[PDB]
Scaffold this active site. Structure first.
Site, mmCIF file in Angstrom:
data_model
loop_
_atom_site.group_PDB
_atom_site.id
_atom_site.type_symbol
_atom_site.label_atom_id
_atom_site.label_comp_id
_atom_site.label_asym_id
_atom_site.label_seq_id
_atom_site.Cartn_x
_atom_site.Cartn_y
_atom_site.Cartn_z
ATOM 1 N N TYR A 18 -11.289 -1.259 -1.258
ATOM 2 C CA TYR A 18 -11.503 -0.757 0.100
ATOM 3 C C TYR A 18 -10.244 -0.046 0.596
ATOM 4 C CZ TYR A 18 -8.989 -3.444 3.715
ATOM 5 O OH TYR A 18 -8.005 -3.932 4.534
ATOM 6 N N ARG A 19 -9.104 -0.247 -0.050
ATOM 7 C CA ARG A 19 -7.836 0.318 0.423
ATOM 8 C C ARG A 19 -6.743 0.203 -0.626
ATOM 9 N NH1 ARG A 19 -5.291 -2.838 5.114
ATOM 10 N NH2 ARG A 19 -3.355 -1.851 5.767
ATOM 11 N N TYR B 76 0.782 -1.225 0.000
ATOM 12 C CA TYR B 76 0.000 0.000 0.000
ATOM 13 C C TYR B 76 0.827 1.295 0.000
ATOM 14 C CZ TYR B 76 -4.155 -2.977 0.827
ATOM 15 O OH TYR B 76 -5.109 -3.962 0.808
HETATM 16 C C1 FAD Z 1 2.582 -7.345 2.904
HETATM 17 C C2 FAD Z 1 1.314 -7.602 3.694
HETATM 18 C C3 FAD Z 1 0.507 -6.599 4.199
HETATM 19 C C4 FAD Z 1 -0.631 -6.915 4.911
HETATM 20 C C5 FAD Z 1 -0.983 -8.261 5.113
HETATM 21 C C6 FAD Z 1 -0.166 -9.265 4.595
HETATM 22 C C7 FAD Z 1 0.955 -8.974 3.906
HETATM 23 C C8 FAD Z 1 1.820 -10.101 3.387
HETATM 24 N N1 FAD Z 1 -2.059 -8.735 5.811
HETATM 25 C C9 FAD Z 1 -2.872 -7.777 6.244
HETATM 26 C C10 FAD Z 1 -4.095 -8.218 6.884
HETATM 27 O O1 FAD Z 1 -4.346 -9.392 7.036
HETATM 28 N N2 FAD Z 1 -4.931 -7.210 7.293
HETATM 29 C C11 FAD Z 1 -4.602 -5.840 7.087
HETATM 30 O O2 FAD Z 1 -5.379 -5.046 7.492
HETATM 31 N N3 FAD Z 1 -3.478 -5.431 6.515
HETATM 32 C C12 FAD Z 1 -2.588 -6.362 6.090
HETATM 33 N N4 FAD Z 1 -1.458 -5.955 5.508
HETATM 34 C C13 FAD Z 1 -1.179 -4.527 5.339
HETATM 35 C C14 FAD Z 1 -0.098 -3.955 6.288
HETATM 36 O O3 FAD Z 1 1.134 -4.522 5.923
HETATM 37 C C15 FAD Z 1 -0.591 -4.337 7.679
HETATM 38 O O4 FAD Z 1 -1.988 -4.075 7.598
HETATM 39 C C16 FAD Z 1 0.030 -3.374 8.669
HETATM 40 O O5 FAD Z 1 -0.470 -3.453 10.017
HETATM 41 C C17 FAD Z 1 -0.246 -1.984 8.083
HETATM 42 O O6 FAD Z 1 0.969 -1.076 8.436
HETATM 43 P P1 FAD Z 1 1.426 -0.540 9.751
HETATM 44 O O7 FAD Z 1 0.279 -0.507 10.732
HETATM 45 O O8 FAD Z 1 2.491 -1.184 10.358
HETATM 46 O O9 FAD Z 1 1.984 0.667 9.210
HETATM 47 P P2 FAD Z 1 1.772 2.144 8.814
HETATM 48 O O10 FAD Z 1 2.544 2.456 7.588
HETATM 49 O O11 FAD Z 1 1.975 2.764 10.008
HETATM 50 O O12 FAD Z 1 0.429 2.610 8.261
HETATM 51 C C18 FAD Z 1 -0.486 3.529 8.931
HETATM 52 C C19 FAD Z 1 -1.087 4.468 7.857
HETATM 53 O O13 FAD Z 1 -2.277 4.999 8.539
HETATM 54 C C20 FAD Z 1 -2.025 6.436 8.811
HETATM 55 N N5 FAD Z 1 -1.517 6.430 10.176
HETATM 56 C C21 FAD Z 1 -0.878 5.437 10.840
HETATM 57 N N6 FAD Z 1 -0.620 5.772 12.094
HETATM 58 C C22 FAD Z 1 -1.140 7.025 12.269
HETATM 59 C C23 FAD Z 1 -1.190 7.927 13.405
HETATM 60 N N7 FAD Z 1 -0.685 7.675 14.562
HETATM 61 N N8 FAD Z 1 -1.800 9.100 13.168
HETATM 62 C C24 FAD Z 1 -2.322 9.437 11.979
HETATM 63 N N9 FAD Z 1 -2.331 8.676 10.894
HETATM 64 C C25 FAD Z 1 -1.729 7.483 11.081
HETATM 65 C C26 FAD Z 1 -1.302 6.861 7.589
HETATM 66 O O14 FAD Z 1 -2.192 6.926 6.506
HETATM 67 C C27 FAD Z 1 -0.328 5.711 7.381
HETATM 68 O O15 FAD Z 1 0.290 5.730 6.149
#
Ligand code: FAD
Ligand code: FAD
Ligand code: FAD
Ligand code: EUG
Ligand code: EUG
Ligand code: EUG
Lengths: 550, 550, 550
Positions: B493-494, B98
């Site tokens: 959805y995403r 994503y």
């Molecule tokens: C590669 C992959 C990814 C994956 C998955 C399986 C694989 C092999 N399985 C998933 C699943 O079963 N369900 C799901 O929802 N997602 C799945 N993923 C996707 C992703 O890798 C995981 O979901 C992971 O938990 C998502 O990333 P993470 O939580 O670690 O990282 P992030 O980059 O921080 O993303 C957050 C995004 O949301 C906003 N954001 C995040 N934190 C904040 C705060 N504190 N404040 C404001 N906005 C926030 C941003 O948009 C950000 O980019």
């Protein structure tokens, strides 16, 4: 100077430094100091709260600046308007219990007006008044008159201590204990530097003293005032004077305080009231007395711990850490020959007159079982009566700083709601204050100062500044007393930096119309929001309430 | 630090450097890093897209900044508002598929919230919930509970992998596979820093925990929450919470996730479906089952290549470079003892109850020729069932990262449209996805996760990041699936950074009223357009659409 | 029509009349009515508060207008924008206890959407949901299904009464007692008319249903929705849906409500608790039960006067005017074979499953001395169980309107704070409520509805609308309970017109940041402040807080 501890909102390091150097070109590095120490009352700090309840660096200056003259303040303000830098004006900075010298907005420049704008400007006998600058302390003023032998002609009105600023205190709506005790009401003719920087003088001060050879070419600041300036406060039109007591509407550079002529006859006295609940009867006796002018000054009803603590710290009366008992309070009262509440007053005038009043008072108060009357002469060398005898005749002293030493690192913080001159009301107020005190683990200590129809109840909170647990109880205690008293129809008359917002939120009739109206006047006169954002809870529109309210 | 690879729009080198140095005074150079390397999943990059489809430096940070606490983010935001510098907030940055950690606007500061705002804040048993910070990964959370022996009382809900952010994932509207699998719907009480910098807490979080001694003087961030904060999401009035899932309306600093009590009984299972077109019957059997609560978690229907690739890379099954055949897919399914589609579920609760459901399920699915039922015990040591058995009971694992290794430099990019829980719809969706896959020369690999009335169809695109020809086919493949699915009444959805605009342009009913309404809310709350311009295609008014749309 | 009783702020008589005549050209004089009568629940008034606590004309319409279709609302809104005329939208107007149909700002046009926008738009079996318009009442919907014999396939979820609006009730975050009892959480795909007058449909509703011959040229309002609209609420991007529950951000014209399939097995039950203080142990028993899913619907704990009053008015149990006693409460419980608190639940599903749950529940509650278990069959003809048995299976009834007749001119007004699912909290909440009630002279009457981790405590205030002394006590009672519960860390979930402001001032953490953020979104979407100024305390910027806050 280079990099401060805390900067003011939205300002960059680069802007600060440009400003401080610009300020330095005007007042000299001699008059500027950058914060990159609590001090005492006799040598007061100017960068923060010496009687701190919040962290000690919570209300903290970024710099201390001190003008040479009125023109320095004009220039400073211009500079604050260029950079949007907040100014927190002081006169002496002796406001401890109420914030000391600290600014409500951390990062502001504290403008110490007292260091260089020091002068007793005029002591006029026939109009019986004086014109003073921020720096004239009460002691100084006292000393000015001694220096010219004016003390057989005019007397002063002083607070409990003698170091405060006649002006500073007068803009805070501060109290004193002679017939001229309502400091604010004694003034007439103030000179202000507004937020745009223009110099204005109120009331009859707006009436120009007429042209004459000897006063040509003087800078506004330095011109004489017309005859009636300091004799009639009103002037003509809107009486703006009050907009400058407890507010952020300008910087006050002069002020006329009216002086009480030698009355030709004086005498202090101490009425002692045995029982803790003799306060109710006492006050009902005081009602008609004050209102009838038998009671001429602002007599004070002190609590027993207030007098005990003047004489000694708590360690000297008990080793106990929790509040004292009812029985111990009787035992300490008996020790010092004081009762549970002690009434202090003074009679002023020809003997014939004094005689009749005193007899009337004496007889009124005789209606309380066990009451005892004392003059100064009749009390120990170290008594409070002898200290107040000085106080009630206009002589400044410092004896009463000692009660601040009740506990180890003694800091006072005042809760100051107003009450009715009625026994019931008083008991109620005290009943509520007292309860909260014992919940927090604090002795209750206080004084009621009797105004004509009202009493200022100074609840005297003493606490250990180096005790995190306790500082947290006082904050708890203070806000709980704010709510409680609020809920009983009473509000505070004056407060500390961290309680202003809660107290201004207490004065919310008709949806806070009162504060709303004030914000309109503030934003109008101070487009940039530079003169002390926050005083009395009035915030200019560039200080978001969500960010800045406590 | 001095001169970045890519700067943010309209910013000068001089402004940047002032800002970065100002940021450094607040967080320390320890917490700041300037871009003047893809990493892995276990140690994720934060400056760009690790699963890049566009050039690898296409979405590129100018700097990585990481706050110490909530106050650091307030100050940072103030600073972004002074200079108009875009912030791209992350929690972990594990969003690969994503965009990973990259910002939509190249040149923004990636705000790594996870490095220092790490704490499991509260694990409350009786209300059965927890309050977490951006940094609490799923694994960590798991480990928190093991550390206090709470795993016999409460369970978690995790994604396929265990490194994601409980919070980060929850704001993305991410999915999991226990009864608490709809992450977003499990929350209650979030704390946000908005674009103006004020701290807000939603729902019952706006109800102040009442004054008490022990909590006086705490900074907003650090105060307790009132009892009901994390038990009832609604609060009073407008339920703004959703405005912070997939959006640019603020920075999320806390969150309450509800936790599922130990159910007293668990059992995984694997139903295998022989024929590629047994998906249609399978899904029709699942319709009433899910809707009737025989199917309690979010059971997943996996494609055979999805399970095959978990076990091995494609080289291990064939040397062929073009997509596999239908016949080879049967042969690989037979090899692993899996069918063409494989259904995964879990039963939760007392045996008596489990018994009846399982029998009902077993009997339903018996209507498909050749179906075979397996528990964990019945499958090889390395099976997916044993990995999911962990997964479906709240235990995080990483076994499933391997399918990303299907091809040489394996990068995944997810196409995620939603489908009906109906065989016909499913076949249709798959029929269209499948065709496009083979036109681009890609194996089709995916999973349907069964929601109550909907299915999330995760089409799992794996491609070689070091192959320009292929990266160009995926971009072609992705946008063609966007159009196609759109044309069939289905939307994603995403999505990934580079597909947001096209997907937001898919949700154009009544002339794009939905995006128009969003731009109004965005420009209102973020006058400067500083919080992540572009997320979900919402652009503030200073980012011309002609310049910034992809 | 000519000259109303109360006009809206700043509007002249001349503007009004031009507007009303313009409105008449669009909807017909048949659909317009100008106020120049309380009614009942079965035929509800729409011009004011039928359960009035303030003067009965305090919240008063200036006119009632009712749109023909969706285009009528677009045109009305345009007109309100021309003239700045406030609109107070309703669906049915059965919100008594919460303001009825009356508008927060007196002089607004009440927009009755229910009169003409009536239609059960779609009842989809395979997706198990419906699409309804403001007017579909619960009884109608019930009837829709019987008419097509859908009641053996899908069931509804209903509040205590059956006349409410499925939609209107769903936007107020209303409760019901089956497993789908959280009305708002069951929705998916709403269509809004915003303050600017554009039509927007949330979530998957923004995903256009694709072009086809048969749907060309349809007005937006009237187009079909794409397959996933009513099956997945989220959509893509910011989830704005919640901005339209309890708020002034738009007019709701359609809504999808998810429907619970026939579970194949049902049974009600009544557990009675003898002692007033068996609430604490009862609630403790319920904690794990609800959280563990043995408790599948929203079982309610009713007070004994709630049940007694259903059966009869107070005159029938006592002639006494002041609140009953403890001893009389026992005597009336014993009379009806109810205890002091009575727990109402329902088991849903295959007998095998029902059997296990029920045994578990029965055994849990057996821990309370004297408890007795009853099914419908075992209670009198007129029992509450038999009414609720209808209620907990989706059948709407009106039997429960009778408790409103506790006192002579019975009006109910709800005090609805939320409480933990814990005996201690419950008792605490009830201890405080109960005290206030007896101080104001009122029987305490209430029900707790058991949410998963929270309880909605509906304190049921019944009072005499034609008794000025009593109406003044309930306003004193209501604002005292607001304060008290506030000080105990509980806030209300929904309220009456005159209590909004005070309840929104209760959700003031971090200086009212929650309300401040709502004002920004409100002013943004409604530049003219026309859609319902005041709902939930959110006032657009042309409604001075000093003028309009209660
Ligand atoms: C590669 C992959 C990814 C994956 C998955 C399986 C694989 C092999 N399985 C998933 C699943 O079963 N369900 C799901 O929802 N997602 C799945 N993923 C996707 C992703 O890798 C995981 O979901 C992971 O938990 C998502 O990333 P993470 O939580 O670690 O990282 P992030 O980059 O921080 O993303 C957050 C995004 O949301 C906003 N954001 C995040 N934190 C904040 C705060 N504190 N404040 C404001 N906005 C926030 C941003 O948009 C950000 O980019
Ligand atoms: C500790 C204490 C304090 C006290 C007291 C007894 C004790 C033990 N007894 C008092 C009494 O009997 N009556 C009274 O009114 N106050 C009493 N105090 C309080 C205080 O210590 C003294 O009142 C003292 O005189 C007050 O401080 P001071 O006058 O020295 O100092 P300040 O910090 O300068 O305060 C002035 C404030 O008013 C505004 N201000 C002051 N000067 C200006 C000018 N020139 N222009 C514009 N604004 C001005 C500011 O709000 C400032 O903070
Ligand atoms: C008297 C009574 C009330 C009651 C109840 C039992 C009795 C004896 N039991 C209830 C229950 O168990 N659960 C519940 O939620 N409410 C209960 N009530 C309260 C009320 O009577 C019913 O809840 C009823 O459904 C509420 O009213 P209704 O739905 O019929 O009517 P309404 O006036 O339209 O109220 C809607 C309000 O929401 C806003 N609103 C409504 N529709 C719209 C649209 N389309 N757009 C924008 N805003 C809308 C307004 O604030 C309006 O006033
Ligand atoms: C003497 C004590 C005192 C302290 C603070 C005040 O504001 C005050 O005025 C009546 C009196
Ligand atoms: C497992 C794979 C997966 C990947 C991305 C998602 O968004 C998702 O949610 C259902 C599932
Ligand atoms: C049954 C009574 C009831 C009344 C008003 C409400 O708002 C409610 O919701 C839980 C329930």
């Amino acid at each position: 100077a280079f990099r401060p501890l805390t900067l003011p909102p939205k300002l960059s390091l680069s802007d600060f430094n440009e400003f401080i150097q610009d300020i330095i070109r005007i007042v000299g590095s001699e008059n500027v100091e950058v914060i990159s120490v609590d001090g005492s009352y006799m040598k007061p700090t100017h960068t923060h709260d010496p009687h701190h309840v919040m962290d000690q660096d919570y209300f903290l200056a970024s710099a201390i600046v001190a003008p040479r003259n009125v023109a320095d303040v004009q220039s400073i303000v211009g500079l604050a308007n260029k950079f949007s830098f907040p100014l927190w004006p002081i006169s002496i900075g002796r406001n401890s219990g109420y914030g000391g010298a600290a600014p409500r907005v951390s990062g502001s420049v504290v403008l110490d007006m007292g260091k260089n704008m020091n002068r007793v400007l005029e002591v006029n006998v026939e109009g019986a008044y004086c014109v003073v600058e921020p720096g004239v302390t009460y002691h100084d003023l006292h000393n000015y008159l001694e220096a010219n032998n004016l003390r057989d002609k005019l007397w002063l009105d002083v607070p409990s201590l003698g170091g405060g600023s006649v002006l500073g205190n007068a803009v805070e709506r501060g109290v004193g204990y002679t017939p001229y005790g309502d400091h604010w009401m004694m003034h007439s003719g103030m000179e202000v530097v507004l937020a745009n920087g223009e110099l204005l003088r109120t009331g009859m001060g707006a009436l120009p003293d007429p042209k004459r050879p000897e006063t040509m070419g003087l800078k506004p600041e330095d011109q004489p005032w017309s005859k009636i300036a300091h004799l009639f406060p009103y002037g003509f039109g809107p009486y703006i004077d009050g907009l400058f007591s407890q507010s952020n509407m300008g910087i006050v550079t002069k002020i006329g305080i009216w002086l009480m002529p030698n009355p030709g006859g004086y005498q202090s006295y101490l009425i002692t009231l045995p029982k803790d609940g003799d306060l109710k009867q006492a006050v009902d006796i005081i009602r008609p007395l004050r209102l009838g002018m038998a009671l001429q000054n602002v007599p004070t009803i002190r609590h027993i711990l207030l007098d005990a603590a003047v004489l000694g710290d708590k360690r000297s009366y008990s080793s106990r850490t929790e509040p004292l008992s009812d029985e111990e309070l009787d035992k300490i009262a008996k020790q010092l020959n004081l009762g549970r509440w002690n009434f202090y007053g003074a009679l002023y005038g020809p003997e014939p007159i004094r005689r009749v009043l005193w007899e009337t008072i004496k007889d009124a108060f005789s209606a309380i079982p066990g009451v005892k009357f004392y003059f100064p002469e009749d009390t120990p060398e170290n008594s409070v009566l002898r200290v107040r005898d000085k106080t009630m005749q206009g002589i400044p002293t410092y004896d009463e700083l000692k009660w601040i030493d009740w506990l180890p690192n003694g800091a006072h913080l005042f809760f100051s709601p107003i009450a009715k001159v009625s026994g019931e009301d008083a008991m109620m107020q005290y009943a509520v204050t007292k309860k909260r005190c014992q919940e927090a683990g604090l002795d209750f200590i206080g004084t009621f100062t009797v105004g004509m129809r009202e009493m200022h109840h100074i609840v005297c909170i003493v606490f250990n500044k180096k005790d995190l647990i306790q500082k947290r109880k006082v904050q708890w205690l203070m806000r709980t007393l704010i709510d409680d008293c609020a809920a009983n129809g009473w509000g505070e008359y004056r407060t500390h930096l961290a309680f202003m917002d809660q107290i201004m939120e207490t004065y919310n009739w008709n949806n806070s119309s009162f504060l709303r109206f004030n914000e309109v006047l503030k934003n109008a006169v101070d487009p940039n929001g530079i003169i002390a954002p926050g005083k009395s809870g009035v915030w200019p529109s560039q200080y978001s309430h969500v960010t800045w309210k406590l």
